[PDB]
Amino acid sequence: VNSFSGYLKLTDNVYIKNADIVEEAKKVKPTVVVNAANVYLKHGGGVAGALNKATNNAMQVESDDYIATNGPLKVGGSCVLSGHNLAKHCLHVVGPNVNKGEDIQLLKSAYENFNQHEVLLAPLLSAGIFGADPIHSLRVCVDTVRTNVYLAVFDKNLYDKLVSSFL
Ligand SMILES: Cc1nc(Cn2cnc3c(N)nc(N)nc32)cs1
Numbered sequence: 826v827n828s829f830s831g832y833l834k835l836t837d838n839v840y841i842k843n844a845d846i847v848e849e850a851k852k853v854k855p856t857v858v859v860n861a862a863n864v865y866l867k868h869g870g871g872v873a874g875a876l877n878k879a880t881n882n883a884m885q886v887e888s889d890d891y892i893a894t895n896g897p898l899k900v901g902g903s904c905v906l907s908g909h910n911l912a913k914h915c916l917h918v919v920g921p922n923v924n925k926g927e928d929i930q931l932l933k934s935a936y937e938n939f940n941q942h943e944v945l946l947a948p949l950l951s952a953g954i955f956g957a958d959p960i961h962s963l964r965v966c967v968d969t970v971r972t973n974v975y976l977a978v979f980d981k982n983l984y985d986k987l988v989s990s991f992l
Contacts, residue, residue, distance in 0.1 A: 827944055828853045829975045835991060839967050843984040844977040846872055846948050847879045850911040855975075858912035859939070859947035860884075861955065862919050864897040866904075871955070872948045880909040888917070900927050901934030916942060923956030932962060936969040944973045952983075963987055 832840035842849070850858045861872040866888035868877035877884040887906055898904060903918040920935040921927035935950050949966070951957035959978070966974065978984040 827973075828855070829946075832975060833988060835963075836967055838971060838973050839976065840974070841963075841976040841978065841984075841987065843979075843981055845875070845979045846946070846977045847875050847911070849977045850876070850908075850946055851879070853946060854912060855908075855944065855946040856913045857916050857942045857945045858908055858914075859945055859950075860915050860917045861948050861950055861953075862898070862903075862917035863922065864900060864902075864919050866892055866898070866917060871953050876911060876915070879911060883907075883909050884915065901931040903935075903938035912946070916945065918950060920951035920955060920962075921957070923951065924954070929957060929961075932957065932965050933969050936966050939966075939970045939974055940972050942972055944975075946975050946977065948977055948979075949987075953980075959983055959987060960990055963991065 832842045860876055868874055868885050898919050900919050906915050908915045918935050918938050921929050921931040932951050939945055949959050949962045952959040952962050
């Protein structure tokens with residue numbers, strides 16, 4: 826048993842809900858929230874900007890120290906940092922940004938990072954302003970993640986399209 830509520834069950838291990846990731850995290854206080862990060866951990870918009878804003882910029886302060894010590898992440902890679910007031914941990918995962926010209930094949934590699942955690946609250950990686958097809962991202966998630974993942978889709982119209990098109 827876990828604290829997640831109001832989810833559509835997609836498969837054995839993947840669940841989905843129409844929710845803003847910030848509101849959904851503050852309610853559950855999951856062990857792990859996934860951030861849709863970039864390699865520089867510059868949390869400007871999308872999921873990253875919203876989560877960071879909810880931490881009063883503490884996520885960005887922690888992230889800048891991480892980058893100063895370690896350098897940038899890889900596209901497809903991740904790091905575990907604090908979840909601040911949103912979760913125990915934040916898993917910062919870099920999916921390919923189609924609007925940066927990055928290879929979409931790296932989306933599977935990005936989702937593989939989720940398998941290092943038994944349960945996660947997460948957005949759809951590489952969707953929204955990262956420019957990939959959300960239907961595709963959901964399919965890659967289902968076909969890659971084996972641990973228990975609770976997906977949040979904020980756009981209602983997108984949520985409706987994802988449910989009705991899911992095989
Ligand atoms: C770069 C990416 N953007 C998304 C979509 N997206 C944007 N803002 C939110 C938000 N507040 N909550 C949720 N669940 N998804 C969001 C997914 S990856």
